[PDB]
Amino acid sequence: LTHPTIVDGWFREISDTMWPGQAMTLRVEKILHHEKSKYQDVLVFKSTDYGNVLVLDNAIQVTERDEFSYQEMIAHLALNSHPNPKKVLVIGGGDGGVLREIVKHDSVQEAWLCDIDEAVIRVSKEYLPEMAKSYSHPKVKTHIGDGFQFLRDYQNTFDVIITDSSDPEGPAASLFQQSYFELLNGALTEKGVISTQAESMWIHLPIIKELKKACKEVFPTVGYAYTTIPTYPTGQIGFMVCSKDANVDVTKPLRSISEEEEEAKYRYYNKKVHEASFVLPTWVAKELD
Amino acid sequence: MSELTHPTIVDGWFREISDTMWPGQAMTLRVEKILHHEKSKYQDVLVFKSTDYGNVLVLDNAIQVTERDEFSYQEMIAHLALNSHPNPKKVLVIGGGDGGVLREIVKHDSVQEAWLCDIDEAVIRVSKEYLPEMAKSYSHPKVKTHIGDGFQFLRDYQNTFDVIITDSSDPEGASLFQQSYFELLNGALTEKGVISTQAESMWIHLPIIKELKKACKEVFPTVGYAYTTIPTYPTGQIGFMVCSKDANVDVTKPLRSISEEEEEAKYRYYNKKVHEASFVLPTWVAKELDL
């Protein structure tokens, strides 16, 4: 097989808008799958050093080697900021990774996925088995469809909502951030928590500042956290973590487990990392104050 | 060929490649113009203007600094060490040819002398021309430079330095970070002396970090591993060993600090909270480094 992103045995992800003037490249052992779904270009290749790689519309989504950092941080930052999460939703979690993290929490009764593209779920089951094993968990429920319409049908339903979806970055996304957070707010229960993929503070601090402002218009409790991902450009990405409960501090874990069971359950997240992930470099902290 | 050319730059992009040290991945930077290329007695020296990260210094095909993001490394390697000493007056940097670490060192009032020892005059000369916001430190009155190999320098200055920072063009790397290198540093330090050394990224070289930590613990009673994020380095980060000869200091929490207002005036990455956070490691790393 061939793919435009793969030349002379190396995958390259480039974006003049997302990451101006820098790229990430990964050595390709073999292309495993390429299809055009009803929604997007779907590429899977086996990399030589990071396991299988899922690429959607030419942007890396996960590699098997380092996916756990993102999945764990976006999920457990939010779940451990709710006193007793019973119904949880991930929007855009087709690869199964966030669902895998959700069902680690015993209190959870239902782990919902809302994703638009069945093709992503199908290829993740075949090529990302350590992520998509979550689909065999009894608590997992999958809705195929538009996330925005699901949220209207399920007002005051979810204790935690996780948006596992690239932060749109144009002037259109900028103006509609607040509208999207208000949509999430309506689907949350009274102390509901959200975590949303944001941006890397090294390259898009102005977008993060905008996201923080939009979040504060909707939620009384707003924080920005980040995690490191060696295959993502700049090497990290951030998350907005917000709660409808004015009384919670999302920057210190409301709930935690013993260090022994953290070591059995998590490879990146723990109660100390939870706090450290909101500790930002001086120039970022000052700009977001 | 009237235009400058370099094997690391293909079709207008610099590629950060090493089949040995980060196999199968390469960060790349778009090049505006190649500015300088020479071969010194010791290494290949390349400078280019990137389109989005300013000027870039590359040594033996490995990126060293870009003007846009160099402050993360320089601040963290310097201030993690300096703020772990109660009153550092004489400081040494080994291999800090770009001048960035010196620039951070001289921000501390207590420092009276900031020595640099580098083998390669070429790096200093090129840095003064192409990295002005780093090499401005060379004109600071506290700064003294010695051109030469750091072993003979350290052997000649025992019980002399309160802090020694090792900033080589690669984390060794010429991986002379055996226990004997740390013993040599131990002797050049004063009785509560502190070292910081470039280590490895925990995403790709955790077994080397564990070995480095064991070797440091053979020499120093107080040893910690911290990291910082660098958007143009492989994996986007690198770690540091921070050690003290004083068993009664905790390097993982800042012994000394300045007010938050002064921090915002002087530092762009480091601060007293980041100091503590930089030793908080992801679970798989922390578990392995406590083993």
Residue numbers in the entry:
A (entry chain B): 4 to 292
B (entry chain A): 1 to 173, 176 to 293
The authors write:
Spermidine is a polyamine molecule that performs various cellular functions, such as DNA and RNA stabilization, autophagy modulation, and eIF5A formation, and is generated from putrescine by aminopropyltransferase spermidine synthase (SpdS). During synthesis, the aminopropyl moiety is donated from decarboxylated S-adenosylmethionine to form putrescine, with 5′-deoxy-5′-methylthioadenosine being produced as a byproduct. Spermidine synthase (SpdS; EC 2.5.1.16) is a major type of aminopropyltransferase that converts putrescine into spermidine. In addition, SpdS contains a structural feature known as the gate-keeping loop, which is located in the vicinity of the entrance to the active site.
Here, we determined the crystal structure of an apo-form of SpdS from Kluyveromyces lactis (KlSpdS) at 1.9 Å resolution. KlSpdS exists as a dimer in the asymmetric unit, and each monomer in the dimeric KlSpdS is positioned with two-fold symmetry. Each KlSpdS monomer consists of three domains: an N-terminal domain (residues 4–66), a central catalytic core domain (residues 67–250), and a C-terminal domain (residues 251–292). Meanwhile, the catalytic core domain contains seven β-strands that form a Rossmann-like fold from β7 to β13 and seven α-helices. The electrostatic surface representation of KlSpdS revealed a large cavity in the catalytic core domain between the N- and C-terminal domains; the cavity was highly negatively charged, suggesting that positively charged dcSAM bind to putrescine in this active site pocket. While the gate-keeping loop of H. sapiens SpdS (HsSpdS) sterically hindered the entrance of the active site, that of KlSpdS had an open conformation. In KlSpdS, the α6 helix kinked outward by approximately 41.0° compared to HsSpdS and by approximately 34.6° compared to A. thaliana SpdS (AtSpdS). The catalytic residues Asp98, Asp167, and Asp 170 of KlSpdS were highly conserved in other SpdS structures. Although Asp98 and Asp167 had conformations similar to the other structures, conformation of Asp170 was distinct, possibly due to changes caused by ligand binding. Here, we found that the first structure of fungal KlSpdS, which was determined at 1.9 Å resolution, exhibited highly similar to that of HsSpdS, suggesting that KlSpdS is phylogenetically closer to HsSpdS than SpdS from E. coli and could therefore utilize a sequential mechanism rather than a ping-pong mechanism.
